[PDB]
């Protein structure tokens, strides 16, 4: 019996007006015998979810100046994602099995980078990736050197899969930055440009190992 609220919202339709007319006729006969406003009341109230409330279970992605991207896990540790022309690493290694041998690192960060590396579409050139894990530090650098069909294309693809912050066409993307750096850092509020969000990592978890090439028959 809450018709009053609905009636103002949608009286345009013919069937409603016919029903109301018939009801009024029947009632009369029986008595004789006896800012952003939509429609009229709906308002475009918006939400800005404070995603810091998920700091205890989920890593959050946010960026500072469209070139410094970040992933924060917990309230104590996070990672830099910097698109730059400067390389902090000059060796083509990724000592993953050494990192697993000496379990002195943070499991969250290693899972983050594992998901990141298993979501790179059609990754086939291992010369590009470089890693440093001494002391538990998480450092991963990528060489974005290049026509398309290049590892740089897929690596930028997975970057904007993760960070969601960003002249290339036909599913090919190029950037003037030669390198990208991922490295360990503490936690602050230094991502004015972008709100922190977990969706980049959760979505990256979807596509992991999906577009991987076979390097051995047995696997």
């Amino acid at each position: 019996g809450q018709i009053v609220t609905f009636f103002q919202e949608v009286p345009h339709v013919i069937e409603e007006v016919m029903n109301i007319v018939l009801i009024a006729l029947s009632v009369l006969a029986v008595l004789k015998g006896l800012t952003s406003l939509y429609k009229g009341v709906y308002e475009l109230q918006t939400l800005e979810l404070n995603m810091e409330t998920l700091n205890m279970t989920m890593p959050l992605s946010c960026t500072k100046n469209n070139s410094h991207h970040y992933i924060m896990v917990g309230n104590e540790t996070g990672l830099e994602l910097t698109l730059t022309n400067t390389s902090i690493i000059n060796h083509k290694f990724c000592n993953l099995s050494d990192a697993h041998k000496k379990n002195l690192y943070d499991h969250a960060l290693m899972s983050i980078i594992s998901t990141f590396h298993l979501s790179i579409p059609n990754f086939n050139q291992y010369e590009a990736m470089s890693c440093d894990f001494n002391g538990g530090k998480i450092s991963v650098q990528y060489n974005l050197s290049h026509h398309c069909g290049t590892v740089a294309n897929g690596v930028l693809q997975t970057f904007m899969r993760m960070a969601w912050g960003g002249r290339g066409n036909w599913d090919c993307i190029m950037t003037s930055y030669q390198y990208l750096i991922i490295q360990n850092t503490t936690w602050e509020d230094h991502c004015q440009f972008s709100r922190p969000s977990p969706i980049g990592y959760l979505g990256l978890l979807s596509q992991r190992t999906r577009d991987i090439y076979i390097s051995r028959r047995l696997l």
Binding site: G1, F6, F7, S26, V30
Partner: protein
Amino acid sequence: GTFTWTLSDSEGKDTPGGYCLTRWMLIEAELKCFGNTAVAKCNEKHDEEFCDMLRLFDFNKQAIQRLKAEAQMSIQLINKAVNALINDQLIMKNHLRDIMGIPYCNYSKYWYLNHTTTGRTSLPKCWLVSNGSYLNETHFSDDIEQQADNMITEMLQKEYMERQGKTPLGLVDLFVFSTSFYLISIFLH
């Protein structure tokens, strides 16, 4: 997960929101338009094959018009979006039906009940193939009548859902109460 891709707007006057297949799509059959109901049917369904195919068609159309062909394939898009376009285990179900020895979906021919007078269509479904040949229309005639009844029930149901969406319950309520109170007045008379 499940599919999430949405159908691009189609330039069909008769069918504004429903994917219309052009001349190129259908072999030697010119252009046919399906309608919004048939294409939107499997926004909850996971057991239809043809609308997954037309989602593939629309994905191809988007990739052509709004990107560049470049004459070399970009498998990245299809490999990323395959779970967002089609169901992932329906092909498994048809592979299993094939292994067991029951007629399985061909995935090339699809049959539908074109309403001659009005031009509505059921969502086309796969023509079963078995024993190395097409099943006779007599063999699955029962399924054909079942799909005809499904068309009838679904069209008689969607109009009910539209009426429910537009007409509130306070109307049909105050109507049945008013008619009952007038019947009471006639009882008094």
